[PDB]
Amino acid sequence: DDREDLVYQAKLAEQAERYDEMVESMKKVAGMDVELTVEERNLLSVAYKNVIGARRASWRIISSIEQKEENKGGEDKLKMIREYRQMVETELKLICCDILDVLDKHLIPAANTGESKVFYYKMKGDYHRYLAEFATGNDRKEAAENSLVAYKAASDIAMTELPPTHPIRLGLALNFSVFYYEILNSPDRACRLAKAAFDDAIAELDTLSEESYKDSTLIMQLLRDNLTLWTSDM
């Protein structure tokens, strides 16, 4: 019941939009070492996504301001921009390493079901990609290596265990395609994997469950929308 109490506190935190309290309540549930239910897996992800998201949204904004004041030549200000970015960067490093560790320690070893195994190996890839975004050089290269072997491990399981209509598999494809395009700067690969996951889905769209319908269609929409932008630039 102490576990159910924590899940409830996370839900109150979600609707209250206090996502710091959400990760904490859901962190204690991960450490419980029991395999998370589909509701708990979602809550944990929604929590750590919003908290890491907020910091990134800031990083990109101040990053653009750094490029603006780079041309202006206001050296006095450029120092403050960098100090503010390095402050936000350390936070991105902490939150990413927080969830990467509890994945490696509690969740990934515990997860036995094909669906759960994929969901986490994907999650690992995402937070290694988020480290790669701001990372510089041999720091970035290590984060990219980690990211790929995670997505690859997720993909190798997803191929046999999950069908192509499954939200988790499509979501993985999208993030792994976004990974290829942004991190590895290989658009030809990003477009293949995206077009592959998409065409595999529409082939068997008649099998898609009403439960998973809204989740997967949105993900498919976000695939074909990214495919349009990537192909029009080529």
Next chain:
Amino acid sequence: DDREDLVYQAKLAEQAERYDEMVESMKKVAGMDVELTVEERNLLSVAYKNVIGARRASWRIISSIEQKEENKGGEDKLKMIREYRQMVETELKLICCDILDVLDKHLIPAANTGESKVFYYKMKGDYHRYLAEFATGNDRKEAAENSLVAYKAASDIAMTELPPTHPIRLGLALNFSVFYYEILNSPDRACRLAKAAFDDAIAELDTLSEESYKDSTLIMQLLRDNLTLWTSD
């Protein structure tokens, strides 16, 4: 430069949407005796509005979840919700008592221009009104009286100093009307006031400047949207 360096850190924090860091940066500039410029005044308001705004949204959502779980009769949950609500109420108290303190101690005295005086007295009413929202019994009535004398003071100054078209005066009239409606349960006054402040603006629409045009017309449109909503089911 110490103050100019802080204003910039606040501006970076504004765009980054890190409003916790924005209040701090602009709190130090306010602590300095020197009166805040219109830009600095705005950056402070923006910073402290967003930090409280977030909690106020949280308070209203959990307060409505409580209301729902009252009918369900989940006593185990109601204790968890009440405790979470209280945690937020204490936060709203601390952040309110911050801005009110730095208003009374530093800004209100320092404020010498007519425009500044109204804005800081308006600001005081706003943050005693936000106290009065989640406040109960004697505490609420005391927060209301504190808000009224603040709004009344601001209004007495705004009538003579500023013109009716000015965004600061229209903003006061709008916040004072919301006060009469939500806090004092005096809706017939709320509407009477909101309309009065509207009529006085449109009468002198020629006087309005192209600079302060957008700021005023937006607040004028809100006053009307409220007036419509309060006078139709």
Next chain:
Amino acid sequence: TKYKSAPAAE
């Protein structure tokens, strides 16, 4: 019931 109030200047 919550109603629009004076927003922070642009």
Next chain:
Amino acid sequence: TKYKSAPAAEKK
């Protein structure tokens, strides 16, 4: 260039 990634799954 920022490109949309996997969103937050709907409740149930």
